[PDB]
Amino acid sequence: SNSIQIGGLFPRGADQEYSAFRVGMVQFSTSEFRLTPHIDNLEVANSFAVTNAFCSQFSRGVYAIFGFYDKKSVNTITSFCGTLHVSFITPSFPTDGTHPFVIQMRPDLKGALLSLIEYYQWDKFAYLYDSDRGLSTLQAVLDSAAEKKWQVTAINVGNINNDKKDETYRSLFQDLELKKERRVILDCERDKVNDIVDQVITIGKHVKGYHYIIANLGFTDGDLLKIQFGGANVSGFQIVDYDDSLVSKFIERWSTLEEKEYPGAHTATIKYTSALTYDAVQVMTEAFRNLRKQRIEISRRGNAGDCLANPAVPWGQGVEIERALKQVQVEGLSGNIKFDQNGKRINYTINIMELKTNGPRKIGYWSEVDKMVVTL
Amino acid sequence: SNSIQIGGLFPRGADQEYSAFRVGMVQFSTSEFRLTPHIDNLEVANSFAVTNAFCSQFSRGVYAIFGFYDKKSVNTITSFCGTLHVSFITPSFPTDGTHPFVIQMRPDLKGALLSLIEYYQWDKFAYLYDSDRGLSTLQAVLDSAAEKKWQVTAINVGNINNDKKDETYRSLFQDLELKKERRVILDCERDKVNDIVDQVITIGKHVKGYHYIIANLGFTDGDLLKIQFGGANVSGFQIVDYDDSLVSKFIERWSTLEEKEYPGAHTATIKYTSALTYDAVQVMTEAFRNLRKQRIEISRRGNAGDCLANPAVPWGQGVEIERALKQVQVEGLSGNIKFDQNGKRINYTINIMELKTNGPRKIGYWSEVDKMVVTL
Ligand SMILES: *[C@@H]1O[C@H](CO)[C@@H](O[C@@H]2O[C@H](CO)[C@@H](O)[C@H](O)[C@H]2NC(C)=O)[C@H](O)[C@H]1NC(C)=O
Ligand SMILES: *[C@@H]1O[C@H](CO)[C@@H](O[C@@H]2O[C@H](CO)[C@@H](O)[C@H](O)[C@H]2NC(C)=O)[C@H](O)[C@H]1NC(C)=O
Secondary structure, eight states, X not given: OOEEEEXXXXXXXXXHHHHHHHHHHHHXXXXXXXXXXXXXXXXXXXXXXXXHHHHHHHHHTOSOEEEOOOTTTHHHHHHHHHHHTXXXXXXXXXXXXXXXXXXXXXXXXXXXXXXXXXXXXXXXXXXXXXXXXXXHHHHXXXXXXXXXXXXXXXXXXTTOOTTSTTXXXXXXXXXXXXXXXXXXXXXXXXXXXXXXXXXXXXXXXXXXXXXXXXOSSBTTSSOOGGGSSSBOEEEEEESSOTXXXXXXXXXXXXXXXXXXXXXXXXXXXXXXXHHHHXXXXXXXXXXXXXXXXXXXXXXXXXXXXXXXXXXXXXXXXXXXXXXXXXXXXXXXXXXXXXXXXXXXXXXXXXXXXXXXXXXXXXXXXXXXXXXXXXXX | OOEEEEEEEEETTOHHHHHHHHHXXXXXXXXXXEEEEEEEEEOTTOHHHHHHHHHHHHHHTOSOEEEOXXXXXXXXXXXXXXXXXXXXXXXXXXXXXXXXXXXXXXXXXXXXXXXXXXXTTOOEEEEEEOTTTOSHHHHHHHHHTTTTTOEEEEEEOOOOOTTSSHHHHHHHHTTSTTTTOOEEEOOSOHHHHHHHHHHHHHHTOSBTTOEEEOOSSBTTTSOXXXXXXXXXXXXXXXXXXXXXXXXXXXHHHHTTSOTTTSTTOSSSOOOHHHHHHHHHHHHHHHHHXXXXXXXXXXXXXXXXXXXXXXXXXXXXXXXXXXXHHHHOOEEETTEEEOBOXXXXXXXXXXXXXXXXXXXXXXXXXEETTTEEEEOO
């Protein structure tokens, strides 16, 4: 048997991620033990919902929770996890701090972004953002601006009501035009980028003389073809490397999976959040394997009880499970996976990309310790 | 014997605010009914703690909750209140959105601040912000910077370990001794403002040629006397007008209370947060009084239950309570109190202040519809 109960907290509509999760469950299945996921699908921005689901898993008796949060709900997660010693493994944006009991699959992007800016020798640009992943990056660029004498125009595009969102664009570009802004960073939710890209194309700002940096880890995850021929420079970041044999092999299978059975999966690419979901199954699997290999018993003796029991007394095995997960080092879709004591990715690589007439191309990479290295 | 129960969620050090709350309960109590508060003292930044306390008050069957939140716990409050139709009345920062079931006693400060900056005809300035407290008003000035043609140098003053503090704050100003920054916006809690004022004085930057804008609603809550004679301009905002008889008559009383019975309350001034709290007791009282004047029965028949009951079916009378709360229009320590449909203060007034050798003086006022008006 060896059935190991875990929770799965999935946003509604995260079909590809859940398909990647199930493929991960197949890939990393083993006779040693079985991960036994209990799945909740919910509105990840709704803290009540996230608390209900967390507590429901907790009372069932899970040994770890894999899932997602939003900026509206990250504090529910870090606070419940930290209080009860339950480990959360997530592909979402890294928490802004050193919160314990959170294993963060997603590498920090800020460093690479700052180096890229320096690399193109920008000292004046617009930073167009929303806040769904917090404001860490905004702070990082403001700090750099002050320190390197950059003139940054930083504008929150997150709050343009899509119910009348067009006069709002003209006024945005009017503001940008005041200083003839031509270098632009887009750090937004993926549909937000696409909205902004259409908006740019429409007013002819996708021509030569413009240069956009897409500040996310999935440059090729969405539709680049529409700005591929206008003449503007377009650059970005990619944590999933389709030239890795490991990734290449996975895509051979992924690309042929039955779409009815694996929604989101009959394609040549996989979104980085889905790749990280797949990699998370490997990490959890290795953690429980390592514990068993170390002869560390983590089996629950009694019921977890109510997540709101007062006083909140953390189970003693919590720390053990946190440590096992943080000590995992493996190779996955997102390259070398290793964590520091705070569950943040270290020793990872981010590929730096440029859009060219013949498609997106790697021009080099950013190293978690060597910064930006061009490929010759 | 008409006991309407309510909750009070008080941050673990909010002594003066609790004193203010207890005073308002006396001032506004009546033979009609007695608000019967149940009080929790808690780590307001701890979302788990906040959920526990909310759920504990929900189970008791309170008819509303007066309380405080933090930027880390605000989502817990809005989600739980919005889901369960439990009204939260608070002097905390207004929410970033139109969340329902939240009565925000504190007026928005962004308009007045943006207006004041324009008034002084600033184009280049430093903005000291406190990440602990939030970035919301910084963002508003960053959004506006293009259209209003400003060059903003934003510095985070928010992760200072009190160990150093002195050294950090001096390093900060001896760094603004680079771009020749002399116009500085504060945007901090009154304590952090005091700390900074203390260091500006020690560094000798409170002289003529520097100008500080304190971006909180309590210009005279702190000690201005010490920076009054240096020669620097110092401007701020004030919502509690001590020239009003209502306020003067209140302070007559407040200055008299025994400090042992009412911590924080043997003084001439009163923090705008405590004033908003006193005001909150009037609003809650009027709302529930008005529900009776309209023979809207709101008495719960059966137990409220568990905040984690599933499915979540909100009680029928929540919406009536919310509406009654939002329909209240009274005059209080913070001036005319009125709310829109999203529980935000409307038709309120913010006084504009400058520090003079003879003390703080009102120089004008800011209105929702008139914007900035020089007084004469
Ligand atoms: C788009 O990329 C091009 C190519 O690097 C940039 O043009 C180069 O950059 C410098 C600075 O303007 C020029 O002096 C070089 O001569 C350019 N190289 C070549 C061969 O074209 C250009 O600056 C980028 N666009 C924007 C708006 O930043
Ligand atoms: C402090 O306040 C004064 C008045 O608002 C600022 O401007 C003074 O008044 C006029 C109006 O521009 C100027 O022509 C004078 O030169 C200013 N007076 C003096 C003696 O400086 C003044 O600039 C403010 N100080 C700062 C640093 O903003």
